[PDB]
Design an enzyme around this catalytic site. Sequence first.
Site, PDB file in Angstrom:
ATOM      1  N   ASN B 184       0.820  -1.221   0.000  1.00  0.00           N
ATOM      2  CA  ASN B 184       0.000   0.000   0.000  1.00  0.00           C
ATOM      3  C   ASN B 184       0.859   1.278   0.000  1.00  0.00           C
ATOM      4  OD1 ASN B 184      -1.393  -1.703   2.799  1.00  0.00           O
ATOM      5  ND2 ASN B 184      -2.093  -2.046   0.698  1.00  0.00           N
ATOM      6  N   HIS B 186       3.143   2.164   2.173  1.00  0.00           N
ATOM      7  CA  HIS B 186       3.426   2.674   3.514  1.00  0.00           C
ATOM      8  C   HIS B 186       4.695   2.019   4.065  1.00  0.00           C
ATOM      9  CE1 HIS B 186      -0.283   4.876   3.984  1.00  0.00           C
ATOM     10  NE2 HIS B 186      -0.996   3.825   3.589  1.00  0.00           N
ATOM     11  N   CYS B 221       5.633   7.099   9.490  1.00  0.00           N
ATOM     12  CA  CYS B 221       6.646   7.829   8.735  1.00  0.00           C
ATOM     13  C   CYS B 221       6.338   7.748   7.243  1.00  0.00           C
ATOM     14  CB  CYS B 221       8.044   7.296   9.050  1.00  0.00           C
ATOM     15  SG  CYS B 221       9.376   8.041   8.067  1.00  0.00           S
TER      16      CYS B 221
END
Lengths: 264, 262
Positions: B184, B186, B221
């Site tokens: 995804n 991330h 992050c």
Amino acid sequence: GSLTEDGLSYKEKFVVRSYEVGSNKTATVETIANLLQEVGCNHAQSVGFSATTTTMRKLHLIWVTARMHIEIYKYPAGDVVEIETWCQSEGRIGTRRDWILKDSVTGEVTGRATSKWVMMNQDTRRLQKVSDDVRDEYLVFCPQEPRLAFPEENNRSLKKIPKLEDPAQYSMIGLKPRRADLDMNQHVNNVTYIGWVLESIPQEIVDTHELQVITLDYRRECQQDDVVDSLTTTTSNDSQFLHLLRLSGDGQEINRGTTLWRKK
Amino acid sequence: GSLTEDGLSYKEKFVVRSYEVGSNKTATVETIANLLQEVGCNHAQSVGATTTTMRKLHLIWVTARMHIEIYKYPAWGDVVEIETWCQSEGRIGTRRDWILKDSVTGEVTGRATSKWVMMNQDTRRLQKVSDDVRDEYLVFCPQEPRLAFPEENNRSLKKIPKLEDPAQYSMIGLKPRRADLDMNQHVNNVTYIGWVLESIPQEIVDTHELQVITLDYRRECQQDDVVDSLTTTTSDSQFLHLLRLSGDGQEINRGTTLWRKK
Ligand SMILES: CNc1cnc2ccccc2n1
Ligand SMILES: CNc1cnc2ccccc2n1
């Protein structure tokens, strides 16, 4: 994973893991490179290595990657992928290790790789041609007839890679290896340099293209306390780039290579 | 890998790979964390991890805390079986526990536990569970409490303090690469574990082994963000960790690690 019937090559199957894929739900190029490396480690172990001979360990010699060439046609998505690796002497230059990646379900070849390895002194980092006696110790584990993964007349693995001129079109500065990037001997894994080369490729190219070919020459090893700079320049549905990895401070070249990308 | 006889837990065996070990020829803490994550992914797949009601409401499961205890790190070549399972934690969220066993000696070489919360994937807001979405996951969970760390007043439920400045040790300019990102896009939660440990000195790593690691996930992050990793000895050896953004000093993580002599 086990040696083939003759014992001149090694095969191993792998199930692609969740943390091994990218945005397109298919195994990343660094995952494929890790699987090729893993199958090569077990081939050395299956024939009795820990891959330096008793003569190599006595004179303090090790095998180091000088060039890596990886061509992927279909990236495995849960899929099972079998890799067949084997080594072959390249006269007095060094060795050559080839790989064939196959889809375990359809049996088709979804990729293939080839690497050139040279004999370097463990301590002085000095290269040297493979002496006759050292060479024949590993000849008994190699096919005698030439069995190349890339047999093509003007194949895209034996071409000279030029040095990237400044200014570079794209760049990714301040890349440092972490403890996960280091191997069992505390050296930065060769696969980390592949990921660093591709860090300068734009996000737009990655989102609209797939990596087909990657040729990479290893010039200098990156120490844990070193910081790298990754540079890229388009040289061209297909797209080609020229890459250069170099130390942040002194600008010492550590790698140089090229990548080919195809439309999705 | 397959669900146990009752179907309330999942088991899977793994052979430790060459590129998965450190200088002591034993699997790194990031490889163990990856194996725990991989076995949890297949447990969710094996039972058919967001439901139709969660997808319609635009909700996702996010890690809030991770606690991992290792006694024996599997060496290169070893087979390690992990047994994972989920359990409701009332209206707070969900708890996922793991038991790592050596496949040869059968002994427990480690165990982990994590607390997961329900967050709206778009607005990043924490929401109350609600009775209806809770009973969808109850059919795949043991009814009686089955905890990997059952001890009352144990190491996985203690409040982690915020590291005071100046930090004794630090590692600045840490950026995630494409390998660190997941499907995804991330930064996967195992990278934050590796970033926390980047501030631990080389002397501590070479003369000690990681026994416990408790880590609270405060903020995610983004790919274009740069982190600063900070450590301070609070003592076996204990440390206090804090991951924060380079610029604004925005806290993204906080945790503690315990190290034993070799
Ligand atoms: C002098 N030739 C070479 C060739 N390949 C290398 C790979 C890593 C480190 C040093 C190397 N030196
Ligand atoms: C405010 N609560 C939380 C809890 N866990 C998180 C993990 C990742 C990102 C944000 C998070 N927020």
